[PDB]
């Protein structure tokens, strides 16, 4: 039931932490858009603090709102939160080659394990690409 996804980004630890959860950065990370995608997220990163992210189709025909609450926050390095009936934990590791971000989350019984893994991996992959555009070197 526990799915783990991981991404490694060639950027400073502080830079990755900033890009991970800053509203201004989220405005860029909006569905990893090149021209524009309709999303909006608001995050209060703290123990007991709430967060929410709403995603919409480009044509505005459909969309969904994902909400959760933070249960543990440590220096942008250890971040654990609860999502509905599920839970997830995010960890940051400093490597000599780069910064590695690891996320472990509960699978939803309504959705395939594989589909959950790919989606959450895609989220981390989007973060990598977002930073990559802040590196201008690859």
What proportion of the residues is helical, as a percent range?
Answer: 25-40%
* CATH class call: Alpha Beta
Strand residue percentage:
35-45%
CATH architecture identity: 2-Layer Sandwich
The CATH fourth-level homologous superfamily: START domain
InterPro entries: ASHA1/2-like_C, START-like_dom_sf
Family: Belongs to the AHA1 family.
Domain Activator of Hsp90 ATPase homologue 1/2-like C-terminal: 11-132
Protein name: Activator of Hsp90 ATPase homologue 1/2-like C-terminal domain-containing protein
List keywords for this structure.
138 residues, alpha+beta, 7-stranded antiparallel β-sheet, 3 helices, 7 strands, 28% helix, globular
Task: Describe this structure as you would to a colleague.
By secondary structure, the protein is of the alpha+beta class. The protein contains three helices and seven strands. It has a seven-stranded antiparallel β-sheet. A hairpin with a 6-residue loop joins β3 (50-56) and β4. This is Activator of Hsp90 ATPase homologue 1/2-like C-terminal domain-containing protein. Belongs to the AHA1 family.
């Amino acid at each position: 039931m526990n799915i783990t996804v991981e991404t490694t980004v060639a950027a400073p630890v502080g830079k990755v932490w900033r890009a991970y959860t800053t509203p201004e950065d989220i405005k860029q990370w909006n569905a990893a858009s090149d021209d524009w995608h309709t999303t909006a997220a608001t995050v209060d990163l703290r123990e007991g603090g709430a967060f929410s992210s709403r995603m919409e189709a480009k044509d505005g025909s459909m969309g969904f709102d994902f909400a959760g609450t933070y249960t543990k926050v440590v220096e942008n390095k250890r971040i654990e939160y609860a999502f509905g009936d599920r839970t997830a934990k995010v960890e940051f590791l400093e490597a000599p080659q780069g910064v590695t971000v690891r996320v472990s989350f509960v699978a939803e019984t309504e959705y395939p394990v594989e589909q959950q893994q790919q989606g959450w991996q895609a989220i981390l992959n989007n973060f990598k690409r977002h930073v990559e555009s802040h590196l201008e070197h690859h």
